[PDB]
Amino acid sequence: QDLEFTRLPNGLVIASLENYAPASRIGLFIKAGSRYENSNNLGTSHLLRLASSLTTKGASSFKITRGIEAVGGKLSVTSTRENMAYTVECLRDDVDILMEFLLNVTTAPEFRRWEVAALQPQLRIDKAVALQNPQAHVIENLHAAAYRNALANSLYCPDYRIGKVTPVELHDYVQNHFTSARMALIGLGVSHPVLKQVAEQFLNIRAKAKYHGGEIREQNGDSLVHAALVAESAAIGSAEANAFSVLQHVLGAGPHVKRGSNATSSLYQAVAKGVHQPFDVSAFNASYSDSGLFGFYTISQAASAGDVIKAAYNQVKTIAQGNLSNPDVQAAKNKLKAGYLMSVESSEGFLDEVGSQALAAGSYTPPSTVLQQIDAVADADVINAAKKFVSGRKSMAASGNLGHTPFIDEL
Amino acid sequence: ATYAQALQSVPETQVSQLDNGLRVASEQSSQPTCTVGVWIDAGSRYESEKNNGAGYFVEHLAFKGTKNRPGNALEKEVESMGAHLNAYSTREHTAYYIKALSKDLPKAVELLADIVQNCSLEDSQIEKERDVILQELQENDTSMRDVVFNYLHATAFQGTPLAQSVEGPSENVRKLSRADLTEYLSRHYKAPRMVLAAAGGLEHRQLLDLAQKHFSGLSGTYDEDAVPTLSPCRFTGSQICHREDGLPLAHVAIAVEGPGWAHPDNVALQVANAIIGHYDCTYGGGAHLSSPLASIAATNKLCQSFQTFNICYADTGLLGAHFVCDHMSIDDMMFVLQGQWMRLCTSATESEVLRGKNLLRNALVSHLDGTTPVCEDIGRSLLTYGRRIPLAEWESRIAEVDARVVREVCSKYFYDQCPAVAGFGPIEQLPDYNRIRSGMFWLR
Amino acid sequence: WLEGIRKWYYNAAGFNKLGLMRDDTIHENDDVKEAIRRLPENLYDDRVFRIKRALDLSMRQQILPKEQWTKYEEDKSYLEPYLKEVIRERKEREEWAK
Amino acid sequence: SHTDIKVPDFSDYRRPEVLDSTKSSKESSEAR
């Protein structure tokens, strides 16, 4: 079948693709990420990721939990700095139940304060777990430096707001962003007019990422240095941004082979020529509706990172000068064509690509057309892309034992 | 357009076989991508104490050069095509596979020959990866989870190969030879014991033309007694208690003897585990969850995590659970965990069984989403069961379940049995095995 | 008339003579503590004083003047809105098991 | 390491019915 798609006069979107799968899948995306938080109501969105499965006007927290598990369904939340996502899974004989539970969470939650207060310390858990993975320190402390207010906001609540988030801020945040204009309802293995029936019946309701640059240095006790160095980018959808996406793979954005030596990654090889001590490196490419970021992510030892980062910085530098050949670029295209299609292979990874476009575009982009956009990329744009990285103002962030780590200006 | 009618429209699986004994299968879909790989009936179970770790050691060098694609030349063709490449190994089974596009099939198959067939195993690389794997063991010494299961199999399956690890001891890693591997490869990698299989946007017929092109050259025969066979292995009831108070948390794992792959009561048990479910401290349901174990654990904070596993081997397996908890909270868990098992052995209701069944339905469906896990399900099922089972037949087997089935089956394999137990960390509070064993029955 | 009878019974009971309200007196119980826990700090911290004052009276075996006694029409049912909620939650837990 | 950990021989103490590593203990558990 083909992906249905439309829009409501209230600005709401619907899609549908009856894949004939046994298990349906429905996902309500939205533009209510963490960038929409001011300095006052921080940690709000982290509470909302957990505020699902709470009391509603349509049902209680107990009915929701068991009513889902009785049919063996699923309920999961995903967030980005821009977008949020409420998603379900179930069998297509059980769609109508999960919707009634889904919308009561989204549309009309009550957020009774005691349930909220019992939920606050869960933040300390979900945060500190995900910060075991050291990248989450770096990336969060990185966006705090590159950008000022909006996209610099953390997905994860800071420590001082714990037990201070009110229901008042939530309902405000609900009413201020959970609007039909910002939403995009999506369903797979499901018919189109059903979601029309649901949305018309129920969902029919009512800052800038200013770049600054800078640097963070989180000295900690750990033998490995985690570090990143980036510059301002192009927003998603620009052909300019596709050039970075190509440039990302030219440098090598992680191994394709298990335990491979990353033979084609110009960075990992360029570092290997200088360094002979365990390391890792890869291309970082973040994109957003207003802006994005590009550069590379670093892992090294405490007494060798100062060599690794310079080598990566020079490899990008040579490519900006003009040192780049077509087949190298053609290879990165074949990678990018693969990275996209392999992402949307599953129902889930597909589902993220559908509504992201739907919120960021007035229509779904078929993947075949995306492949055409890849081929449209010129090698010179990829070079001018690298020029921006070198010439543009930088943003930096690290964590570890920084006894030998340089700064921006030394690079 | 119901659940059953979607099961009806599932693509039927193709199969075939080469003259040299090799098996072939596939599933066609409308995807632009495709996953293809090889699945072997080889692992550490087939290994002796002196070649313990070989099958894991080969996992490195298979992607480090061949007779025709020496060195890293192999890696360059994969990354050139944008595909991925991956491997894994188990105590029974080993698999290499490629994740690539629909058009790039004939090169994917081309490599999987040259990987299996012509692995040069360069002596320089043999010594490099020797150092690497000793570095991996030091890392896996910290992955406390992997330690427990490795300790667990050591005790359940004493005096047998299954007690071994996939990686084997560091000694054999140091005391290994090229000759030991050529013996291992020339013995086990035979077409009859192997499987090629795929899934995605391809066709079965396309796969055959490449199999004969490449895989016709395999050794489809062997000497009178070259290929070993697997006897049953001796489960035993035992405990291992690796005390380490310096570490802040306590991993635990208890289990019993399992049926095996092909035994039909595996279905009923996957429900029984699913009734108990699984938990981490990140799940937001908390007290209101259905599994009264998970409900209690989130309430009283008896733990940070637990789960329910059923590892299935050729004619036996492990059945039990894993859990993490503070050293002042173990005795409470083993008193509730065993309670739920004995609860089911004595009295379980259709509602919660029905709750468990609906979970098992979704897991199989949700697990089969993507060309990769599908061809995994093809590969091992053709090795374990000999065929593949479609979801229609799984559902049919589920349909024959009710409360009566669960009470009986759990009573066979939980009630008053001699389990295996494992611990690692401040396990001082851990009940001694006669108290564990005391709670494996009731006085009711 | 019954309203007049309800009123007389209230004064006959006498927990107005100790300045208490009705809901201050209810039997401590699982469904109740849940409801009490959900009270706000203002209303709760008032409940504690209405009680601790009353106990200080019964110790002395005294009461308050008529000017401070609780009036029938002023008998606030501050706890029932939260309590009837809890009992509803309980019956769902029971009904869900059945 | 942890993989170097192996159980010693208990066969001096094991019951005679369960001294064969190659057989399934279940068949005589009912008798044991």
Residue numbers in the entry:
A (entry chain O): 22 to 227, 235 to 439
B (entry chain N): 2 to 445
C (entry chain F): 12 to 109
D (entry chain R): 1 to 32
Could you share sentences copied from the article?
1 is the central component of the mitochondrial electron-transfer chain which is responsible for the electron flow from ubiquinol to cytochrome c. This occurs via the oxidation of ubiquinol and the reduction of ubiquinone in a process called the Q cycle. Ubiquinol is oxidized to ubiquinone in the oxidative (Qo) site, with two protons released into the intermembrane space, while ubiquinone binds to the reductive (Qi) site, where it is reduced to ubiquinol and takes two protons from the matrix. This process allows proton translocation from the matrix space to the intermembrane space, thus increasing the electrochemical gradient across the membrane.
One quinolone, SCR0911, has been reported to have improved solubility and metabolic stability, with nanomolar activity against P. falciparum. The apo data set was resolved to a global resolution of 4.4 Å and the two inhibitor-bound complexes were both determined to 4.1 Å resolution as calculated by Fourier shell correlation (FSC = 0.143; Scheres & Chen, 2012). For the two inhibitor-bound structures, there is clear inhibitor density at the Qi site which does not appear at the Qo site, supporting that these are selective Qi site inhibitors. The density within the Qi site suggests that SCR0911 adopts a conformation which is consistent with the crystal structure. The quinolone head of SCR0911 is placed between residues His201 and Phe220, and the biaryl tail further extends into the hydrophobic region of Ile39 and Ala232. However, gross changes in the side-chain position can be detected; for example, His201 shifts in position between the two maps. For SCR0911, His201 is well defined and is in a position consistent with hydrogen-bond formation with the inhibitor, whereas the density for GSK932121 suggests that there is no hydrogen-bond inter­action with His201 and the density is more poorly defined. In both structures the ligand can form hydrogen bonds to His201 and Ser35 on the neighbouring helix. The Qi site amino acids adopt similar positions in both structures, with an average Cα r.m.s.d. value of 1.46 Å; there is a clear overlap of the α-helices. There are minor differences in the positions of the amino-acid side chains, such as Phe220; however, this could be owing to the difference in the resolutions of the two maps.
